[PDB]
């Protein structure tokens, strides 16, 4: 319902609220299915590379999948 109502948001805050809602939906997916969570994580990272929680969660999921074989990514994020 929040995503449906996002169409009525003022354009100034529309980008920020869309990013927030997509992050929340990606969290719900990560609870349900990690693949869609990672997809939305990539979508938001392309949309806003400056956000940290998205990158943290994406790298954390990658480390879970790669058994901590992305130490370079963690160092770069640090």
């Amino acid at each position: 319902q929040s995503l449906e109502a996002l169409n009525n948001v003022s354009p100034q805050n529309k980008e920020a609220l869309s990013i927030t809602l997509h992050y929340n939906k990606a969290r719900v997916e990560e609870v349900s299915n990690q693949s869609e969570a990672e997809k939305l994580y990539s979508k938001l990272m392309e949309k806003c590379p400056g956000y940290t929680s998205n990158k943290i969660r994406y790298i954390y999921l990658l480390a879970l999948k790669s058994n901590g074989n992305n130490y370079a990514d963690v160092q770069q994020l640090l």
Partner: peptide
């Protein structure tokens, strides 16, 4: 520096 991030 991004007003969007702020």
């Amino acid at each position: 520096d991004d007003p969007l991030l702020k």
